[PDB]
Design an enzyme around this catalytic site. Structure first.
Site, mmCIF file in Angstrom:
data_model
loop_
_atom_site.group_PDB
_atom_site.id
_atom_site.type_symbol
_atom_site.label_atom_id
_atom_site.label_comp_id
_atom_site.label_asym_id
_atom_site.label_seq_id
_atom_site.Cartn_x
_atom_site.Cartn_y
_atom_site.Cartn_z
ATOM 1 N N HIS A 61 103.574 -62.568 -104.899
ATOM 2 C CA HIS A 61 104.726 -61.986 -104.189
ATOM 3 C C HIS A 61 104.966 -60.494 -104.490
ATOM 4 O O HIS A 61 105.511 -59.770 -103.662
ATOM 5 C CB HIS A 61 105.964 -62.809 -104.512
ATOM 6 N N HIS A 91 109.074 -54.778 -111.646
ATOM 7 C CA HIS A 91 108.261 -55.015 -110.460
ATOM 8 C C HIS A 91 108.867 -54.206 -109.329
ATOM 9 O O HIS A 91 109.910 -53.592 -109.470
ATOM 10 C CB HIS A 91 108.222 -56.530 -110.135
ATOM 11 N N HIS A 93 109.322 -53.834 -104.786
ATOM 12 C CA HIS A 93 109.297 -54.349 -103.417
ATOM 13 C C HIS A 93 108.980 -53.149 -102.520
ATOM 14 O O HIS A 93 109.494 -52.071 -102.807
ATOM 15 C CB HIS A 93 110.641 -54.960 -103.024
ATOM 16 N N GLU A 103 115.105 -53.387 -100.802
ATOM 17 C CA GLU A 103 115.968 -54.584 -100.628
ATOM 18 C C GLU A 103 117.410 -54.162 -100.430
ATOM 19 O O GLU A 103 117.989 -54.428 -99.370
ATOM 20 C CB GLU A 103 115.746 -55.484 -101.853
ATOM 21 N N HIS A 116 112.641 -52.753 -109.636
ATOM 22 C CA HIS A 116 113.578 -53.632 -110.358
ATOM 23 C C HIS A 116 113.146 -53.764 -111.815
ATOM 24 O O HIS A 116 112.033 -54.248 -112.077
ATOM 25 C CB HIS A 116 113.621 -55.024 -109.729
ATOM 26 N N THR A 195 116.616 -61.841 -105.985
ATOM 27 C CA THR A 195 116.297 -61.643 -104.567
ATOM 28 C C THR A 195 115.053 -62.413 -104.148
ATOM 29 O O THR A 195 114.674 -62.364 -102.968
ATOM 30 C CB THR A 195 116.063 -60.184 -104.186
ATOM 31 N N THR A 196 114.431 -63.174 -105.065
ATOM 32 C CA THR A 196 113.357 -64.073 -104.780
ATOM 33 C C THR A 196 113.800 -65.457 -105.255
ATOM 34 O O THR A 196 114.635 -65.563 -106.186
ATOM 35 C CB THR A 196 112.075 -63.709 -105.538
#
Ligand SMILES: [Zn+2]
EC number: 4.2.1.1
Length: 257
Positions: A61, A91, A93, A103, A116, A195-196
């Protein structure tokens, strides 16, 4: 099973994780004019001088850099937080194009990416326990815009070719996360969620106002990662972001005027 595609993406997640439709989901749009300056908020304390990075992993992901969180070596305190939060990992996004990827949004603006840095509250002893608590995690979110390179990101960029597909990892020692931070620690904060999946409602979000700039070449390297395992059809790891969720009776507070 979950992912970011048409058949397993964010709009599907509520079937396996019903809290997806909960009262404190993340990310959100930060309406800058509605956020209230709170003069009681402390400056954020980011103490990363003794950080010990361990590994970098493609988890299908996103990719993540992990830290030794067995002692108070890299900690977040102050700001809206009570107590001490240990850095576990960071990590990102990101998007398929520079106009999407973050996000959180700021007055509906999407940034090219969002970093993040995930921390857990030491009073819960371990991250698994912490995600079961409403004040278990503190995630420091930093926006990435495209322009000048971020020299401190390059060590990360350069190893991504070694973790292309899901399941690949590498040793990743002596990485200094201070090299990913903007000048200002001015922030917005609100109570939210991972958020996951599992989308747990355990996060105090601290989103910095000032983005970092990264180069097109740096972000292009993110976009060469694969969601798939080696042997499966190649699907570029892009657009691994959850859209803004309903604010629902939360207030976003600003540390600054
Ligand atoms: Zn994240």
């Amino acid at each position: 099973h979950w992912g970011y595609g048409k058949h397993n993406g964010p709009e599907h997640w509520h079937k396996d994780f019903p809290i997806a439709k909960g009262e404190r989901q993340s990310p959100v749009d930060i309406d800058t004019h509605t956020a209230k300056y709170d003069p009681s908020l402390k400056p954020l304390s980011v103490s990363y001088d003794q950080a010990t990075s361990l590994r970098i992993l493609n988890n299908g992901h996103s990719f993540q850099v992990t830290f030794d969180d067995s002692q108070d070596k890299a900690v977040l305190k102050g700001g809206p937080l009570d107590g001490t939060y240990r850095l576990l990992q960071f990590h990102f996004h990101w998007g398929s194009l520079d106009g999407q990827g973050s996000e959180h949004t700021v007055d509906k603006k999407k940034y090219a990416a969002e970093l993040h840095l995930v921390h857990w509250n030491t009073k819960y002893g371990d991250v698994g326990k912490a995600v079961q608590q409403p004040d278990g995690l503190a995630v420091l979110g930093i926006f990435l815009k495209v322009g000048s390179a971020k020299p401190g990101l390059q060590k990360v960029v350069d190893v991504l070719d070694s973790i292309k597909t899901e399941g690949k990892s590498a040793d990743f020692t002596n990485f200094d996360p201070r090299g990913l931070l903007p000048e200002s620690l001015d922030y917005w904060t609100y109570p939210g969620s991972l958020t996951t999946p599992p989308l747990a409602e355990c996060v105090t979000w601290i989103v910095l106002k000032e983005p970092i700039s990264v180069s097109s070449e740096q972000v292009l390297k993110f976009r060469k990662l694969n969601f798939n395992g080696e042997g499966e059809p190649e699907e570029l790891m892009v657009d691994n972001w959850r859209p803004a969720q309903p604010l629902k009776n939360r207030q976003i507070k600003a540390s600054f005027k």
